[PDB]
Design a protein around this motif. Structure first.
Motif, mmCIF file in Angstrom:
data_model
loop_
_atom_site.group_PDB
_atom_site.id
_atom_site.type_symbol
_atom_site.label_atom_id
_atom_site.label_comp_id
_atom_site.label_asym_id
_atom_site.label_seq_id
_atom_site.Cartn_x
_atom_site.Cartn_y
_atom_site.Cartn_z
ATOM 1 N N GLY A 12 -7.807 -35.773 -11.061
ATOM 2 C CA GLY A 12 -8.318 -34.474 -11.457
ATOM 3 C C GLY A 12 -8.085 -33.376 -10.436
ATOM 4 O O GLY A 12 -7.068 -33.349 -9.738
ATOM 5 N N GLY A 13 -9.036 -32.438 -10.451
ATOM 6 C CA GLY A 13 -8.952 -31.214 -9.665
ATOM 7 C C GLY A 13 -9.083 -31.455 -8.175
ATOM 8 O O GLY A 13 -9.969 -32.198 -7.741
ATOM 9 N N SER A 16 -16.868 -30.781 -18.326
ATOM 10 C CA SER A 16 -16.624 -30.499 -16.919
ATOM 11 C C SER A 16 -15.692 -29.309 -16.738
ATOM 12 O O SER A 16 -15.601 -28.761 -15.638
ATOM 13 N N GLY A 17 -15.120 -28.793 -17.814
ATOM 14 C CA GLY A 17 -14.309 -27.599 -17.719
ATOM 15 C C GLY A 17 -12.852 -27.952 -17.465
ATOM 16 O O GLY A 17 -12.498 -29.100 -17.181
ATOM 17 N N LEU A 18 -12.021 -26.910 -17.598
ATOM 18 C CA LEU A 18 -10.568 -26.822 -17.285
ATOM 19 C C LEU A 18 -9.784 -27.791 -18.173
ATOM 20 O O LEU A 18 -9.925 -27.661 -19.400
ATOM 21 N N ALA A 19 -8.906 -28.649 -17.613
ATOM 22 C CA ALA A 19 -7.954 -29.478 -18.374
ATOM 23 C C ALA A 19 -8.642 -30.540 -19.225
ATOM 24 O O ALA A 19 -8.077 -30.983 -20.239
ATOM 25 N N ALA A 20 -9.789 -31.040 -18.743
ATOM 26 C CA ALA A 20 -10.613 -32.012 -19.461
ATOM 27 C C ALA A 20 -11.152 -31.439 -20.774
ATOM 28 O O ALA A 20 -11.222 -32.159 -21.776
ATOM 29 N N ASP A 21 -11.584 -30.164 -20.760
ATOM 30 C CA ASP A 21 -12.031 -29.460 -21.968
ATOM 31 C C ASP A 21 -10.892 -29.278 -22.970
ATOM 32 O O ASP A 21 -11.118 -29.361 -24.185
ATOM 33 N N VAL A 22 -9.680 -29.011 -22.453
ATOM 34 C CA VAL A 22 -8.462 -28.852 -23.253
ATOM 35 C C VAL A 22 -8.082 -30.168 -23.945
ATOM 36 O O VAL A 22 -7.810 -30.187 -25.160
ATOM 37 N N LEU A 23 -8.109 -31.282 -23.178
ATOM 38 C CA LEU A 23 -7.821 -32.632 -23.686
ATOM 39 C C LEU A 23 -8.856 -33.116 -24.702
ATOM 40 O O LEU A 23 -8.494 -33.736 -25.715
ATOM 41 N N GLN A 64 -12.133 -32.460 -14.609
ATOM 42 C CA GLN A 64 -11.560 -31.076 -14.477
ATOM 43 C C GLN A 64 -10.034 -31.183 -14.525
ATOM 44 O O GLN A 64 -9.471 -31.607 -15.544
ATOM 45 N N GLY A 65 -9.351 -30.811 -13.452
ATOM 46 C CA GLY A 65 -7.917 -30.959 -13.361
ATOM 47 C C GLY A 65 -7.108 -29.721 -13.704
ATOM 48 O O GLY A 65 -7.552 -28.798 -14.386
ATOM 49 N N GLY A 66 -5.924 -29.700 -13.085
ATOM 50 C CA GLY A 66 -4.893 -28.705 -13.258
ATOM 51 C C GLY A 66 -3.731 -29.255 -14.082
ATOM 52 O O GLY A 66 -3.934 -30.165 -14.894
ATOM 53 N N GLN A 117 -5.502 -19.766 -21.154
ATOM 54 C CA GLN A 117 -6.582 -19.296 -20.293
ATOM 55 C C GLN A 117 -6.808 -20.231 -19.105
ATOM 56 O O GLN A 117 -7.159 -19.779 -18.007
ATOM 57 N N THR A 118 -6.545 -21.530 -19.280
ATOM 58 C CA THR A 118 -6.777 -22.483 -18.198
ATOM 59 C C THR A 118 -5.607 -22.608 -17.222
ATOM 60 O O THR A 118 -5.756 -22.362 -16.020
ATOM 61 N N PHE A 119 -4.436 -22.989 -17.727
ATOM 62 C CA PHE A 119 -3.266 -23.291 -16.917
ATOM 63 C C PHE A 119 -2.443 -22.105 -16.438
ATOM 64 O O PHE A 119 -1.819 -22.230 -15.375
ATOM 65 N N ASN A 120 -2.471 -21.005 -17.197
ATOM 66 C CA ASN A 120 -1.710 -19.777 -16.857
ATOM 67 C C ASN A 120 -0.206 -20.068 -16.948
ATOM 68 O O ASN A 120 0.450 -19.927 -15.910
#
Ligand SMILES: Nc1ncnc2c1ncn2[C@@H]1O[C@H](COP(=O)(O)OP(=O)(O)OC[C@H]2O[C@@H](O)[C@H](O)[C@@H]2O)[C@@H](O)[C@H]1O
Ligand SMILES: Nc1ncnc2c1ncn2[C@@H]1O[C@H](COP(=O)(O)O)[C@@H](O)[C@H]1O
Ligand SMILES: O=P(O)(O)OC[C@H]1O[C@@H](O)[C@H](O)[C@@H]1O
Ligand SMILES: [Mg+2]
Ligand SMILES: [Mg+2]
Ligand SMILES: [Mg+2]
Lengths: 313, 432, 48, 24, 48
Positions: B99-100, B271-278, B246-248, B306-309
């Motif tokens: 992860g992050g 937990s937000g970020l890449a985990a929310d996307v998955l 999380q994660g990038g 919005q997450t990865f840009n």
């Protein structure tokens, strides 16, 4: 909550009296001619590069005097197999059913204008635009290479049996194969052989690619065969379009007829043992949506299938 | 301490271990002097690192991207076999935490809850936890968890393998030059190297530095990490469970490689970020519950943007396509919610991920026995009973009953004895 | 301010399906004998 | 489960444009 | 917590915990302490 939503969408479900106000939002970039331009490196050619052209210069109505395409024919095609036309295209009749070795070949394009014949060499000119490359390339037949695609569909169902629902529409699921040559997922299908129709080609390619039954796996139990025959007896031709295939040239292009075999109950589709064979590596059930990254213009074909079945896309 | 001159590597046949010189075995590992180099040169960067306030030293090996992961697995097995003897405690679970690392900011309650679940799972299954080798984010947090775990253990200490891309490590230059057997080399986390700025985590028990001839580039160790975990999973016949917090973009690539190599993943939703996307992607494609009927590809695309840009449409298409490719197979993704479901159901998600694999049925029953979930074992046995499957059940019931006796689970002993396991046809693991 | 540009596609999708429901005479208080307001009404309905 | 199945089959219930691929 | 909102939560958690102690509500004290309120960063209302 599920029934309330289902009954609610079963109620307020739904060119003349139609107005488009998107011009207020975009402006002068409302619509553009977003045509197809194939990639620069021809696949499986050993680094041979086309003559690069912009997407706004492609249609045949436009003059374009600065056009110097490259003549390329693949060694496999140039070795003259049974499914390849002769290198000199004279005495061949286009736009009608032509008999080669007593076998019928279609040779008719779905373009409204038709195929025009060049007077100098006798070779056909592609009506769907310029591609920066003459010759046959990897395609064995001059002009229209008829492809048949088989979209075997079933409703995407949960373990309880209820169909999954997204954006107020029922969600489809189709059999997708991973191609051997370029490793992109695609609809099973293949080129129409000499002397054969779309029915046999569609069924034969689905059996060879998605199931692997083409003299390489084993014989099917023969009760299962009746189910597969029952599945294949009700097919609807949903589209006959021009493929955005990267192997297309100015003298040979792929045009597809799409046949949809839909399993309403889902019983026959569940008895299929998917195993990639012939020119397919892996086969699997894959959800149909608009963000799919598939080979050639198969997204357009899936759009046509969902349009016909009123499914999500 | 006296430096080792010969090492015992287990044979490819899996029947015994043969002793050979360290330089002969260690010849198969390569390094790149520059990116252009393909064939490579002999590695010469392996040994042990001594960290401040840590009693034990941690082995390190710098290897190339083209190297066989089975060889690296043999290296880890050979060191553990050397230190603890031939009959060391084999892992029944490989827990990969990814992860992050930089922008890994989280509320304290979410950490503690994931930490509690991770600590329990790790302490009950004697799991090998594989994270990255650096001193940042969730890996550093996981390092603290296994640091606390490392105190209550008496003999066998489970390795905390850190797989990191070489080229980002501030003590990387000091370790490679020199005499190949470097016993107890001091690692200086506070020393100022100008081009690189990422230090190693002091709580990790072993380090694999993956090299590709680059400097200050991340994500080069992802394919080897997934392949190494898969190779380890086949060798010890143990399920591999990846956990995503999380994660990038590289965490997305880690999950993509993991799902391509057959390894199940557990995505921590909320937990937000890449985990929310998955989690959003999995819930959109597979979950038939009602809250997820308004989910769309457009909102998912908005979340990825919005997450990865990605800064371009083609890049956005590749990330979105990769995210959808991760959750294509519903069995290989298990979504844990730290804000909707219960507090003590994270181990159920890990067990569901274990149960979602194809083979290693005796190990799957053993894994169910470790987490104290009889109902799961009962349902698996009932399904096997309904599905005939008499050959696979009879071959593994004896060892499972034996294992249940060794780990003190009487309910599992009565259950296994009820499912046609003859008491006098029990067999020992070794040969007298 | 400028809209985020993913939100713009949604607004364009909303505005692509409009039906002219009426073209009537307004009961507007500013109407006179030589200038009167007549309206065309466009309905943009969001089913989902 | 009975109503869900009944409402589900009440929805997606259903010689020109018809092709028979049983010959393959 | 679900809506991110870390700035507004951190600015008011200390005074709320303080207020919960003054009005004798221990359940609210444990609740506020569970929601990331550091005990030693509590501030008085007036200035000494
Ligand atoms: N393993 C790492 N250690 C330290 N810093 C890192 C790492 N990977 C990336 N970074 C730095 O963090 C920045 C972005 O942080 P994240 O979004 O946290 O990076 P992420 O993609 O989450 O990390 C991927 C890596 O993490 C590991 O769990 C996993 O092995 C994967 O290789 C990047 O610009 C990079 O400089
Ligand atoms: N008209 C055709 N054009 C190009 N290749 C063909 C054609 N007909 C048969 N083939 C062969 O069939 C292979 C794959 O097509 P298919 O198996 O029918 O999907 C090709 O790689 C060729 O070897
Ligand atoms: O012979 P292959 O390449 O497998 O089949 C041809 C494919 O190329 C696509 O344009 C056609 O729709 C068809 O699916
Ligand atoms: Mg084929
Ligand atoms: Mg094919
Ligand atoms: Mg063929």
């Amino acid at each position: 909550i599920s029934f309330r939503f289902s009954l609610d969408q079963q109620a307020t479900k739904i060119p003349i009296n139609r107005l488009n106000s998107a011009v207020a939002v975009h402006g002068h970039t409302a619509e553009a001619a977003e045509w197809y331009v194939p990639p620069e490196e021809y696949p499986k050619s050993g680094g041979v590069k086309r003559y690069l052209i912009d997407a706004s210069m492609v249609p045949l109505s436009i003059m374009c005097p600065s056009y110097d395409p490259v003549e390329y024919t693949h060694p496999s095609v140039a070795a003259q197999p049974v499914w390849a036309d002769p290198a000199d295209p004279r005495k061949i009749k286009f736009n009608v059913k032509d008999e080669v070795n007593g076998k019928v070949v279609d040779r008719t394009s779905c373009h409204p204008s038709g195929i025009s014949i060049d007077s100098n060499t006798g070779r056909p000119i592609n009506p769907w635009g310029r591609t920066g490359m003459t010759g046959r390339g990897l395609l064995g037949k001059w002009g229209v290479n008829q492809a048949a695609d088989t979209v075997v569909t079933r409703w995407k169902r949960s373990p309880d049996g209820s169909i999954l629902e997204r954006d107020g529409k029922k969600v489809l699921e189709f059999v997708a194969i991973q191609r051997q040559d370029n490793k992109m997922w695609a609809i099973p299908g293949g080129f129409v052989d000499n002397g054969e129709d779309v029915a046999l080609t569609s069924g034969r390619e689905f059996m060879e690619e998605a199931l692997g039954m083409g003299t390489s796996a084993d014989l099917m139990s023969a009760e299962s065969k009746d189910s597969l025959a029952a599945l294949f007896s009700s097919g609807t031709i949903v589209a006959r379009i021009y493929c955005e295939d990267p192997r297309n040239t100015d003298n040979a292009w792929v045009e597809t007829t799409c046949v949809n075999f839909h399993d309403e109950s889902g019983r026959h589709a569940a008895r299929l043992k998917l195993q990639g064979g012939d020119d397919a590596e892996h086969a699997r059930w894959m959800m149909v949506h608009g963000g799919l990254n598939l080979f050639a213009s198969h997204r357009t074909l899936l759009q046509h299938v969902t349009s016909a079945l009123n499914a999500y896309f | 301490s006296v430096a080792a001159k010969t090492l015992l590597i287990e044979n490819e046949d899996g029947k015994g271990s043969t002793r050979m010189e360290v330089q002969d075995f260690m010849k198969r590992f390569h390094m790149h002097a520059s990116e252009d180099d393909k064939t490579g040169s002999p590695s010469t960067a392996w040994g042990t690192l001594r960290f401040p306030t840590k009693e034990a030293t941690a082995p390190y090996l710098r290897l190339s991207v083209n190297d066989d992961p089975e060889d690296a697995l043999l290296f880890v097995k050979a060191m553990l076999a050397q230190k603890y003897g031939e009959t060391y405690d084999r892992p029944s679970l490989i827990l990969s935490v990814t992860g992050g690392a930089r922008n890994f900011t989280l509320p304290p309650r979410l950490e503690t809850a994931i930490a509690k679940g991770l600590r329990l799972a790790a302490q009950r299954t004697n799991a090998w936890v594989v994270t990255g080798g650096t001193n940042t984010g969730v890996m550093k947090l996981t390092g603290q968890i296994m640091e606390a775990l490392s105190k209550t253990q008496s003999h066998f200490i489970p390795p905390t393998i850190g797989i990191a891309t070489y080229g980002v490590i501030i003590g990387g230059d000091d370790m490679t030059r020199g005499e190949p057997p470097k016993i107890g080399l001091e690692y200086e986390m506070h020393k100022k190297d100008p081009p690189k700025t990422t230090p190693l985590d002091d709580n990790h028990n072993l380090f694999l530095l993956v090299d590709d001839g680059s400097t200050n580039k991340f994500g080069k160790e992802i394919k080897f990490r997934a392949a190494f975990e898969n190779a380890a999973g086949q060798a010890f016949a143990a399920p591999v469970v990846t956990i995503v917090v999380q994660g990038g973009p590289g965490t997305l690539g880690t999950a993509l490689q993991a799902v391509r190599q057959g390894t199940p993943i557990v995505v921590v939703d909320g937990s937000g970020l890449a985990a929310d996307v998955l989690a959003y992607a999995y819930n959109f494609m597979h979950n038939p519950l009602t809250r997820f009927k308004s989910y769309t590809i457009d909102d998912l695309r908005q979340k990825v943007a919005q997450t990865f840009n990605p800064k371009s449409s083609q890049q956005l298409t590749n990330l979105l396509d990769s995210a959808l490719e991760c959750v294509q197979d519903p069995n290989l993704v298990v979504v844990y919610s730290l804000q909707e479901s219960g507090i003590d159901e994270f181990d159920d998600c890990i067990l569901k991920a274990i149960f979602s694999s194809q083979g290693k049925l005796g190990n799957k029953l053993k894994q169910a026995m470790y987490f104290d979930q009889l109902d799961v074992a009962k349902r698996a046995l009932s399904e096997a009973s309904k599905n005939g499957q008499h050959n696979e059940i009879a071959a593994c019931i004896n060892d499972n009953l034996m294992a249940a006796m060794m780990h003190n689970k009487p309910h599992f002993v009565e259950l296994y004895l009820g499912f046609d396991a003859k008491i006098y046809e029990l067999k020992p693991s070794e040969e007298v």
